[PDB]
Amino acid sequence: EMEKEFEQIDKSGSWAAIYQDIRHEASDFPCRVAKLPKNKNRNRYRDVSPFDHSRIKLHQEDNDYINASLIKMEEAQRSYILTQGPLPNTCGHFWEMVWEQKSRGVVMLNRVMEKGSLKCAQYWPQKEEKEMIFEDTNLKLTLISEDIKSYYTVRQLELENLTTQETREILHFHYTTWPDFGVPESPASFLNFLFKVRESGSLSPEHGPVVVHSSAGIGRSGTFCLADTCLLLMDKRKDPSSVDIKKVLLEMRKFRMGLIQTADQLRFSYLAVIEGAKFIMGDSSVQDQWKELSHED
Template sequence: MPTTIEQEFEELDAHRRWQPLYLEIRNESHDYPHRVAKFPENRNRNRYRDVSPYDHSRVKLQNAENDYINASLVDIEEAQRSYILTQGPLPNTCCHFWLMVWQQKTKAVVMLNRTVEKESVKCAQYWPTDDQEMLFKETGFSVKLLSEDVKSYYTVHLLQLENINYVENLWITMYLKLLRLDVKRPLKSGETRTISHFHYTTWPDFGVPESPASFLNFLFKVRESGSLNPNHGPAVIHCSAGIGRSGTFSLVDTCLVLMEKGDDINIKQVLLNMRKYRMGLIQTPDQLRFSYMAIIEGAKCIKGDSSIQKQWKELSKEDLSPAFDHSPNKITTEKYNGNRIGLEEEKLTGDRCTGLSSKMQDTMEENSESALRKRIREDRKATTAQKVQQMKQRLNENERKRKRPRLTDT
């Protein structure tokens, strides 16, 4: 199977046909109505004027006065995969974003861009970066940071999403009961959910990752969490526009699933099928070429290519600590300890004694990793805050007069 795709890849490379192939895909892609996105009341909910969800596949917010959000449900039945592809939230749509995550029973959010790239704001800061929770009163949710795991090219956040409408709902329910009125529909009471936030931090603007290996390692970390499995709600995938990098991620994952099932795949046809659900998936010939490379390398690893597996093993050594620890000998949990995240290890009954010197070494390594994670986090927060402040100063001067931009994120 990979050999056939490899031959196709080599021929495309040899004849420099990536641009023609990309144009073929664009020309063969169908256009569907997207009228709702153009309603006057929805214009300020779109990051780009030329990227809109199709009416037939748009995600609808439930129990909301306005059900619109720039997000599309991409359903690939043969791969048993469903993704919600969406734009990077705007300051005024962060509340809608978390409402969607809650209503769709999403287990993970996959973010493929940085909030600020080349001095341009690509996405609002919709999740907390410290122990201060973020409140979204418009839709009644709060988000807390439970843990942060910083790697060399991606970061995994564990977030707590809470429905904070329960206080108001509880009083309404009690009032109705006092009036002896029948409460037909029981109201929620303070439900919380844990959301994994996978943030790929090294995908360059207007480009592709340096190698398929790092991208695939990230993809398989997401897979290992179980967040993409069909027994959960669809994972939310986003970049800035929700079509370029997000399309690449979804295409590679879908093709690898189909190959694992033993199906013959036609990458072009799979992409054309995915484009029926959201416009413009895969934005450049380079992203198309990278998708082929990642699918070829991923298929080799799945089929047990020892050289590829060794390469990934070496790559994984760059990680500061594992994102998911499946070790049977210990349970590693991260939780708040005062104003910082503390690492706690709970040994199981059968764990072997490692000696005092080993424990001291482990403690030193943990403290070193904690300090490094803290320093990286603080540097990133300071840089982002400075850039965002500069952008706000420029944007506030002419925000009302300026029209919505066209897509610049690829």
């Protein structure tokens, strides 16, 4: 049982040790393409690169590289694309990926500016009347509407392939109060957000994988995906207590390095899954409780 595992770790003061063990056991795969000199301006951080085996390839002959990885969770039957916050010169690549991968939703867990420093480009329009055109990939992006809540914002965007003239509605789920290398204000606020993404239909297998990002696409991003996949497994398995969150995280790390960046983020992931499980195990009244507890504007 996760509650028992959580207490065992918490009471012994072993979070740093458990987390460091996961880091030590994590997969080590090559990232040769990410390191090619010509790709230097496509990486936000020198210490965060996608593995070659799981990287997302752009469908262009020029240069198919983007710092993004496909996290394919076989048993959970869900895939996610984790990517860095787009750079000024990779915003067109980012939307090209969204288009090509048939994604319906984009989950952003960081702010454009954090601690007086730029952590992600302003890759979507802030005003309806000021749409964006990405010349390099021939895509147009328009803000259709946005619903701003106390700690997160949901936006409806229209993405158009200017080559084929076809358009698609993309849902943007922006968590605006999650500090870098920090944790959500509470399991409640996090789960309320996660279930909003779920209820939107964006994570449905009928769509391409949801695109999840933070500044590097590994810390807050890994937390989001780890919680979601664990809950998926608990709903799917005969014995939900058989889900080992540490093993799920190691499985995810076979696809992208460094998922979950701090011991406290790992600790928070346990709390988020333990709380979310109360809903999966029936008692769907907790969902309204998180809603109320989140104080979403």
